[PDB]
Amino acid sequence: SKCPLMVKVLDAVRGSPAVDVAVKVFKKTADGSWEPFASGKTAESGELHGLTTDEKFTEGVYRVELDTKSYWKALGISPFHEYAEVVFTANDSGHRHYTIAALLSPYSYSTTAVVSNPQN
Amino acid sequence: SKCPLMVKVLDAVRGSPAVDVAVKVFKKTADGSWEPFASGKTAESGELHGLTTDEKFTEGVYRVELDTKSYWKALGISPFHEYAEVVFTANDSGHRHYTIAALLSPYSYSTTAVVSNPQN
Amino acid sequence: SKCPLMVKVLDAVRGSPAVDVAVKVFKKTADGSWEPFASGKTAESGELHGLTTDEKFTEGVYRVELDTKSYWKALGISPFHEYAEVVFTANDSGHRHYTIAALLSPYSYSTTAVVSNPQN
Amino acid sequence: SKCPLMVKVLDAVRGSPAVDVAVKVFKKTADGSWEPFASGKTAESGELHGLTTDEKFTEGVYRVELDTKSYWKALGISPFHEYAEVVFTANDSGHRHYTIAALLSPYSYSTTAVVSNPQN
Numbered sequence: 001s002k003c004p005l006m007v008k009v010l011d012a013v014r015g016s017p018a019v020d021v022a023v024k025v026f027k028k029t030a031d032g033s034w035e036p037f038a039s040g041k042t043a044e045s046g047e048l049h050g051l052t053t054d055e056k057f058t059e060g061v062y063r064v065e066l067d068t069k070s071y072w073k074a075l076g077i078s079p080f081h082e083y084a085e086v087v088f089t090a091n092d093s094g095h096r097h098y099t100i101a102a103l104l105s106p107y108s109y110s111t112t113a114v115v116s117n118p119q120n
Numbered sequence: 121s122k123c124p125l126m127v128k129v130l131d132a133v134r135g136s137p138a139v140d141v142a143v144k145v146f147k148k149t150a151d152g153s154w155e156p157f158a159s160g161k162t163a164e165s166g167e168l169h170g171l172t173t174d175e176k177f178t179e180g181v182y183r184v185e186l187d188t189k190s191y192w193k194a195l196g197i198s199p200f201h202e203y204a205e206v207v208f209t210a211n212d213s214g215h216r217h218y219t220i221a222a223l224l225s226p227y228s229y230s231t232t233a234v235v236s237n238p239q240n
Numbered sequence: 241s242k243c244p245l246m247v248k249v250l251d252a253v254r255g256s257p258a259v260d261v262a263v264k265v266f267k268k269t270a271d272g273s274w275e276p277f278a279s280g281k282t283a284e285s286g287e288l289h290g291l292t293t294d295e296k297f298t299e300g301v302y303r304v305e306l307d308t309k310s311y312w313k314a315l316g317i318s319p320f321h322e323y324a325e326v327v328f329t330a331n332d333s334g335h336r337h338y339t340i341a342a343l344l345s346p347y348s349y350s351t352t353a354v355v356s357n358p359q360n
Numbered sequence: 361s362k363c364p365l366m367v368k369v370l371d372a373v374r375g376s377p378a379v380d381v382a383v384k385v386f387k388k389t390a391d392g393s394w395e396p397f398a399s400g401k402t403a404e405s406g407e408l409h410g411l412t413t414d415e416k417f418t419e420g421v422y423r424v425e426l427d428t429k430s431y432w433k434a435l436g437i438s439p440f441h442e443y444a445e446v447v448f449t450a451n452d453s454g455h456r457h458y459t460i461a462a463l464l465s466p467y468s469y470s471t472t473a474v475v476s477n478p479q480n
């Protein structure tokens with residue numbers, strides 16, 4: 001695809017894009033600590049665009065945190081999970097473009113990853 | 121563990137097994153069409169064991185229909201699917217044990233097959 | 241300009257779009273029988289477009305059938321289901337645009353819908 | 361029945377329980393840190409029963425972490441996610457039962473919570 005790191009969030013109760021979800025991305029440092037990498041909020045389409053350029057998105061372990069609790073909390077639903085979280089290693093083989101899709105439900109959530117090579 | 125076929129249904133919105141969901145089993149005939157094989161409704165545990173006996177369950181194509189629409193209509197929710205349907209070929213490679221599991225949400229559902237192998 | 245019905249299919253084992261998944265759509269008729277509506281195959285993006293147009297896609301019960309067995313059998317994988325079927329009611333509340341997403345795995349498949357308005 | 365906390369994992373590629381999957385439960389401590397709580401690996405049934413007891417399992421925010429990466433590698437399969445974490449608040453509505461389920465695939469995973477009522 002185009003964006004190096006793309007996050008898409010869906011709402012399985014209303015069958016619509018989960019708009020305004022707090023997304024935070026962190027990067028593991030040499031000593032094992034968690035350093036804030038980037039963050040945003042999903043738009044009307046349930047997508048988050050512009051987290052990182054390929055230059056900035058270097059090889060390493062990443063952590064994407066979606067604040068699922070606030071989403072449900074705003075609608076008057078009390079969810080189970082405090083947050084949804086996806087931890088993964090990136091560009092260890094070579095530079096790839098990732099899409100992290102997540103489907104939300106008060107007591108459940110499933111997450112998938114689409115890895116696509118930018119070059120031939 | 122005794123009955124070769126079991127249906128386990130869960131509700132993703134409330135964090136609980138889905139109770140009294142209509143489950144109808146259809147088996148494909150030789151002339152081409154389908155014919156009623158069994159029926160029942162999920163219990164308190166969200167399970168439905170005791171459909172058929174290891175003897176009446178012969179090899180062939182099957183169809184497990186779950187009336188998901190009624191289930192949500194009862195909670196004030198207008199779901200998306202008319203029903204969840206699972207079609208598969210059973211016991212082509214000798215006798216087995218299949219537990220089909222469904223995860224329900226108004227606008228989405230995940231179905232899963234679990235095959236057990238009784239020591240013959 | 242965007243078409244009413246869309247199908248997006250991902251592969252969970254490989255983490256990429258499912259290319260060449262055979263797709264068949266049906267429409268329920270007055271008799272309570274099924275009539276051939278459309279058909280196609282997912283492109284490289286794992287998507288399917290031009291299944292139909294706004295004028296042809298009226299109110300009614302539809303059945304999108306996905307040939308998921310051939311897909312796996314082609315890769316050397318022996319799946320469980322013969323195909324993944326999605327039955328739903330369209331253009332209930334007047335005109336709408338639909339998106340059927342299906343996530344594939346050998347013994348499991350998760351399908352979700354995203355209903356959106358063309359003007360809202 | 362007498363297990364306050366339960367974890368069940370399934371493999372979506374082989375269609376059977378995820379055996380020998382390492383589980384580690386943490387509990388947010390008084391000073392805000394994560395303290396070890398329970399550890400174990402999925403039995404043949406892909407589940408853990410001896411996790412904790414109705415008395416040791418008190419109120420608080422727990423963290424369940426499944427080591428999926430190691431599960432997949434020991435099969436020759438290189439997975440996407442580093443691991444699967446599930447963080448939740450427990451016993452906020454009295455002393456009830458908790459079942460955490462997970463459906464694993466190389467590039468995707470689903471989780472759901474089933475919260476029962478012991479004496480109901």
Ligand SMILES: N[C@@H](Cc1cc(I)c(Oc2cc(I)c(O)c(I)c2)c(I)c1)C(=O)O
Nearest residue numbers: 128221222223232368461462463470471472
């Ligand atoms: N007597 C059985 C009943 C039961 C069977 C299954 I199989 C199961 O597992 C899942 C996990 C996920 I994640 C799903 O999406 C689905 I559908 C089913 C669960 I929980 C409970 C027991 O308690 O073991």
Ligand SMILES: N[C@@H](Cc1cc(I)c(Oc2cc(I)c(O)c(I)c2)c(I)c1)C(=O)O
Nearest residue numbers: 008101102103110112248249250341342343
């Ligand atoms: N970009 C286009 C096409 C597209 C639609 C969806 I909807 C989507 O999201 C999911 C999320 C999960 I979780 C799945 O299992 C599956 I399959 C698809 C993705 I990625 C891409 C659009 O915006 O319509």
